[PDB]
Write a protein that binds this ligand. Structure first.
Ligand SMILES: CCCCCCCO[C@H]1O[C@H](CO)[C@@H](O)[C@H](O)[C@@H]1O
Ligand code: NA
Length: 158
């Protein structure tokens, strides 16, 4: 089991960390949400699907930068909604092919009344998402750590 971003930045068997750079709507009013889909940019696969079933959770999601200070959030994982920042681990998604399959995570962020300016800074860390992988074969229990960076400034009009 290993993962990589859409541009091929990889985390190998056993886990580790990688950076993910996301485009963000450049102007978000206080009545709109800022949506950060990560499923189009984070992918994983199973290295021995003939035998092993891999199980993958969102173990934790933490907010940084302007997302932490200027937005409130939820995260959807595999079609279910949770608070963001998270409070506990989600249920599992199965990975059962050597072909890359998306990691089904997206953030839904709402400006808080204080927002703001600049609401999110280009190049800044905005989230850290921990993917936890186990299987039905052995003791492997690995963290894949995704550091999410904003590509661009986001302005919240006032
Ligand atoms: C004849 C025994 C072959 C043994 C191959 C084990 C490969 O293990 C790797 O790939 C497995 C399948 O993705 C993962 O469940 C495991 O955590 C690790 O990432
Ligand atoms: Na990418």
């Amino acid at each position: 089991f290993a993962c990589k971003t859409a541009n091929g930045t990889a985390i190998p068997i056993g886990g580790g960390s990688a950076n993910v750079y996301v485009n963000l709507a450049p102007v978000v009013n206080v009545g709109q949400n800022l949506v950060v889909d990560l499923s189009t940019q984070i992918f994983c696969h199973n290295d021995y699907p003939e035998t092993i079933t891999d199980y993958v959770t969102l173990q934790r999601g933490s907010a940084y930068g302007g997302v932490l200070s200027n937005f409130s959030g939820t995260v959807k994982y595999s079609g279910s909604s949770y608070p963001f920042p998270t409070t506990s681990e989600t249920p599992r998604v199965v990975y059962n092919s050597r072909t890359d399959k998306p990691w089904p995570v997206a953030l839904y962020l709402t400006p808080v009344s204080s927002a703001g300016g600049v609401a999110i800074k280009a190049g800044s860390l905005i989230a850290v998402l921990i993917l936890r992988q186990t299987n039905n074969a052995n003791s492997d229990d690995f963290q894949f750590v995704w550091n999410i960076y904003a590509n661009n400034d986001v302005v919240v009009p006032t």
